[PDB]
Design a protein around this nucleic acid. Structure first.
Ligand code: ZN
Length: 253
DNA sequence: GTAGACCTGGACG
DNA sequence: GCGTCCAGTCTAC
């Protein structure tokens, strides 16, 4: 659900760190609510698309959250239905941590026990420590850049809106092989990765709408027809790809 | 296994 | 503005 989205969720968690969990609800099968209640939320960490919560009385237990298309974290607030589905049923949170003075609700998310966190901001596109050397080394391989950009090892937080928009901003075709691009090209691509993700975050802190340049658009800024197709491994959830053949000619061998 | 809703912003008509 | 569409986890079958 993109790395800016996870930074927001982590921030919503932050004021509850250090409080006793009083009651635990939600519909999730796996996580026995009788492991959390009356422990303290003693740490919260975010890395790329993952959120890690630690529970203990200090090391401790870690719950990892990985969110779906409609996944969300909500602070002392419930989501509700606004109209009838084509065939009004409110969404059911998967986990709720209740504190003495508020709660956190977790929706449309796989939640599981883990040994701990893996939170390193070298591989994280929004962190100050984002390691562009390793990102470039990943981008230069003989693979379409649109595939490599989604590798969370090098671009933690990069999802489909970022993929599609930055490829347009760099005027790079999504099937161009990183090995057939110039070093200047891939430098512009990294610049746009960082700039666009940060700008989107700025728009999100205010209530400003993010307007797509290529993503889900019929025409490009120049007025061309935008092509849409799906590329990558069949497991992938971000195969959908928008591009303008005119502004993003495929670089050739 | 497959088919599809999703409480929703952003983009169309 | 008004209406409609659709883009990881979960459910139905
Ligand atoms: Zn164009």
């Amino acid at each position: 659900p993109e790395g800016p989205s996870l930074r927001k969720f982590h921030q919503l968690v932050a004021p509850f760190v250090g409080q006793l969990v009083v009651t635990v609800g939600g519909n999730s099968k796996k996580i026995n609510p009788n492991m959390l209640e009356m422990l303290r939320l003693q740490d919260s960490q975010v890395h790329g698309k993952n959120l890690y919560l630690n529970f203990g009385l200090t090391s401790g237990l870690w719950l990892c959250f990985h969110f779906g298309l409609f996944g969300s974290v909500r602070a002392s607030e419930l989501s509700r239905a606004t109209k009838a589905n084509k065939r009004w049923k409110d969404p059911i949170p998967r986990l709720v941590l209740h504190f003495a003075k508020g709660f956190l609700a977790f929706y449309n998310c796989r939640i599981y026990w883990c040994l701990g966190p893996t939170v390193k901001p070298t591989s994280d596109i929004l962190s100050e420590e984002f390691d562009r050397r390793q990102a470039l080394e990943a981008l230069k391989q003989a693979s379409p850049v649109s595939y490599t950009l989604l590798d969370q090892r090098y671009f933690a937080g990069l999802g489909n809106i970022i993929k599609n928009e930055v490829l347009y901003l760099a005027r790079i075709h999504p099937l161009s092989l990183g090995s057939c691009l110039t070093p200047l090209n891939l430098e512009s691509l990294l610049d746009h990765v960082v700039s666009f993700s940060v700008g989107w975050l700025q728009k999100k802190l205010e209530g400003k709408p993010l307007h797509h340049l290529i993503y889900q658009k019929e025409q490009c800024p120049a007025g061309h027809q935008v092509m849409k197709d799906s590329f990558g491994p069949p497991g992938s959830f971000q195969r959908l790809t928008w591009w303008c053949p005119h502004c993003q000619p495929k670089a050739e061998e």
